[PDB]
Amino acid sequence: MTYKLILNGKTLKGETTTEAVDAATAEKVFKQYANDNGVDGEWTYDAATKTFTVTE
C-alpha cells in the first residue's frame, strides 16, 4: 500500500514516501526511520488523504 509521510522535524524538514502492506506497518516503518533520523514528537495521519504527517 503506497504511503507518504512528511518529515517536518523542528529544524530538519523532508518529505518521504514508501510501500507497506497496511497503514500500521507503514507508520511503524515511517516511525522507525523517523526515529532513526532523530525525527518524531507529533504524529498526525488521515485516511482521506492517505498521507502521514510528523513534526517535533
Give the technique used to solve this structure.
Answer: NMR
If one counts every other C-beta atom within 10 angstroms of the C-beta of residue 29, the result is 16
Helices marked H in the chain: 23-36
CA–CA separation, 28 and 5 (whole Å)? 11
Domain 1-56, classified CATH 3.10.20.10, yes or no: yes
Cβ-contact 26, 14 below 8 angstroms: no
Beta-strand pair 13-18/51-55: unpaired
The three cell numbers locating residue 13: 524538514
CA–CA separation, 27 and 5 (whole Å)? 8
Domain spans in the chain, listed from the N-terminal domain onward: 1-56
